[model samples]
Target: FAHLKSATPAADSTVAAPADLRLTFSEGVEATFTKVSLSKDGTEVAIKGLETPDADKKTLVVTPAAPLAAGNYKVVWNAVSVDTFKSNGEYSFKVKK
Candidate 1:
């Protein structure tokens, strides 16, 4: 499985609004099969979609359609690794006022 290793903004942290959500994994993942979704106060936010920049496919980048407003945000991800194993989880963070 593509175990989540780390993430930008960090779970439960308070930060300035971010331009993108970057998630790194313990193993390579299939970009096309991976899904990363963002929501604020239960409403989904538009995004530019996911991208795999690393040659090893261990990193997924999500660009929101617009800068996020000040609020609590949640990220839910489903990761399918190169080995065909699947894993998923969710985390939350907050944007400063």
Candidate 2:
């Protein structure tokens, strides 16, 4: 929740398709236990996550197999802080034409 510091593509931002997405937090997290997903319109878009957690910086990075097309995407995430507390939240980012 509040641990979330920033989101790439940025929440509620209108932008073009992205090669990947990034989420930074105020605290370190277990990248292996972290999960993220994407949805748009009324259905889910497949996002196979490739993790590379930055313990030094407390950031979790994820990338899609391919770039997304124009539309609005809902970003869903579940993060477990290093202290073992779990946080979950969602936000929206748009991909412009």
Candidate 3:
């Protein structure tokens, strides 16, 4: 089982609103059981994500219904790698106005 590789909006960084979120891992994961959540300022923000995992890459992409406002936000994720090992973690990012 492998751990998280990296993330966009990259943990603790500030950036402009993105159409979706990307999570890359060291090993392949099963999106069927994986879940990525988005929230802003401690409140849940409505977001839409891919029902399936990205193809040919060890990445999970999720899209929000709309762009986020300039505010602090957190991305929390959990996944079960193909090997069946489960991993979970959270990261914070800020959207520019």
Candidate 4:
């Protein structure tokens, strides 16, 4: 299973509220097995949508339903590689006012 590396905006750093969260996989991900989400602690945050840019199939984008507040947040993802192995991981980031 391939792992995720170098998430845009940098995991665990404070930054301007982002319009979306982005993740890059180490290998090509199966479109049907890919999912991206934003949450606080464990409760789900409303997500506007998830997008895959044609430029890169390994990159996944997540748009938020509304502006987020300053706090600790987590990005949860699950992806299945082209080989059909399922992989999942979570990372944390903070938003500042």
lDDT of each: 0.90, 0.80, 0.79, 0.79
Q: Candidates sorted by TM-score, descending order?
A: 1, 2, 3, 4
TM-score, cand. 3 vs. native: 0.86
Tens-place lDDT per residue, model 1, 1-97, is: 7888888888889999888988889999998889888999899998888888989998899899998999989999999999999999999999998
Give the winner by TM-score. Answer: 1
Model 3 spans with C-alpha error above 4 angstroms: 51-57
Q: Report the lDDT tens digits of candidate 4 across residue range 1-97.
A: 7589878768888887888888888877766667777887567899877766855467777778988777789988888777787899989998888
Global Cα lDDT for candidate 2? 0.80
Candidate 2 Cα outliers beyond 4 Å, as residue runs: none
Candidate number with greatest lDDT: 1
CA error at residue 78 for candidate 4, angstroms:
0.8
Write one digit per residue (lDDT tens) for candidate 2, span 1-97: 3288898888999997878888888888777787888887757878777465554648777787667889878988888877888999888989998
- Compute the lDDT for candidate 4: 0.79
Which scores better on TM-score, 2 or 4?
Answer: 2
Instruction: Give the per-residue Cα lDDT of candidate 2 at 82.
Output: 76
